[PDB]
Amino acid sequence: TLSILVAHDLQRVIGFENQLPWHLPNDLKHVKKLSTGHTLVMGRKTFESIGKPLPNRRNVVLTSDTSFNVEGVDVIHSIEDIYQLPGHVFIFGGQTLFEEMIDKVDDMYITVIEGKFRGDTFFPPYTFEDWEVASSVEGKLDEKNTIPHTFLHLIRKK
Numbered sequence: 001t002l003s004i005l006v007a008h009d010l011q012r013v014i015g016f017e018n019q020l021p022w023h024l025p026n027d028l029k030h031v032k033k034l035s036t037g038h039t040l041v042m043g044r045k046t047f048e049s050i051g052k053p054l055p056n057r058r059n060v061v062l063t064s065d066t067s068f069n070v071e072g073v074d075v076i077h078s079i080e081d082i083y084q085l086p087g088h089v090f091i092f093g094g095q096t097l098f099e100e101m102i103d104k105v106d107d108m109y110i111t112v113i114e115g116k117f118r119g120d121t122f123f124p125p126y127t128f129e130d131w132e133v134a135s136s137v138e139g140k141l142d143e144k145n146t147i148p149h150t151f152l153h154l155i156r157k158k
């Protein structure tokens, strides 16, 4: 199973200066629940943003750099390697990966951040005429999660 996993704001911002624009623990907890025990596929810049492989799952980085060899990371070098990997693979970012994979994945786990952030990287446009809402669940606000957000699970129609 091939999934996108992504947080994006009302204008589909995903990124600013190689970090997330928002502070939102609940969504990182969401990511953790989903991807633990499974595989993340991520491009190099995104990996460099996370810095270390995420515990307790397979971390796969897509890069052209054949020097690349990082303890705890699998390297692949073309998009097409993605479809080898076994099990539930989450496409994990960034803009270039989402743009490359969005027409190819079975389904997407999106967190809509109900906010307008300044960004420099974006999730590509998509339509609900294409994507059916398997679930929509409001995140809870609290001291430490103070931006409204909705967990969507969307499945390619038809």
Ligand SMILES: NC(=O)C1=CN([C@@H]2O[C@H](COP(=O)(O)OP(=O)(O)OC[C@H]3O[C@@H](n4cnc5c(N)ncnc54)[C@H](OP(=O)(O)O)[C@@H]3O)[C@@H](O)[C@H]2O)C=CC1
Binding pocket: 005, 006, 007, 008, 013, 014, 015, 016, 017, 018, 019, 020, 042, 043, 044, 045, 046, 047, 049, 062, 063, 064, 065, 077, 078, 079, 092, 093, 094, 095, 096, 097, 098, 100, 121
């Ligand atoms: N909100 C969210 O859910 C998430 C947001 N982000 C954000 O996304 C942004 C990063 O996106 P972006 O800047 O596009 O970078 P990416 O993380 O998508 O990585 C870009 C790099 O990935 C590698 N790559 C991509 N496609 C290929 C390919 N087909 N073959 C070989 N290598 C490939 C290249 O690495 P190289 O040049 O080394 O060869 C390329 O430079 C950041 O701002 C980050 O904060 C990231 C993940 C999640």
Ligand SMILES: COc1cc(Cc2cnc(N)nc2N)c2c(c1OC)O[C@@H](C1CC1)C=C2
Binding pocket: 005, 006, 007, 015, 018, 019, 020, 027, 028, 031, 046, 049, 050, 054, 091, 092, 093, 111
């Ligand atoms: C671009 O930066 C990040 C992207 C991401 C990617 C990411 C974040 N949020 C969502 N919903 N999907 C994603 N694909 C993460 C992330 C990032 O910064 C550390 O942090 C980690 C937390 C510490 C364990 C997890 C994810």
